Every structure is written in structure tokens, then in C-alpha cells.
Design a protein around this ligand. Structure first.
Ligand SMILES: [Zn+2]
Length: 49
């Protein structure tokens, strides 16, 4: 039903012992939440530039 992504939430809890969310196969050891959250840290600026 239009569901499913590269990564699949496994029975393993997110790396962070404070994150109640599980870590996906493409987000591990972090989860979808943290994963993206971390990305912000590193940025290449505007696509154009
Ligand atoms: Zn997490």
C-alpha cells in the first residue's frame, strides 16, 4: 500500500539509549529520526553553489 523504504525497522532499538525508536537497516546504528538529525551537522550549502 505504498509503504516500505530502502531501510527496514529491525527489532533492534536505536543506538541512542534515550531514543525509543528503532534503528532501520539504512539508518543503523541510528534511526530515521537521529540519522537525519545528524545529517544537519554536515552541510554542503546550496545545491547551486
Ligand atoms: Zn534514534
Amino acid at each position: 500500500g505504498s509503504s516500505g523504504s530502502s531501510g527496514s525497522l529491525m527489532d533492534v532499538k536505536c543506538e541512542t539509549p534515550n531514543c525509543p525508536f528503532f534503528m532501520s537497516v539504512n539508518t543503523q546504528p541510528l534511526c530515521h529520526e537521529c540519522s537525519e538529525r545528524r545529517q544537519k551537522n554536515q552541510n554542503s550549502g546550496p545545491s547551486s553553489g
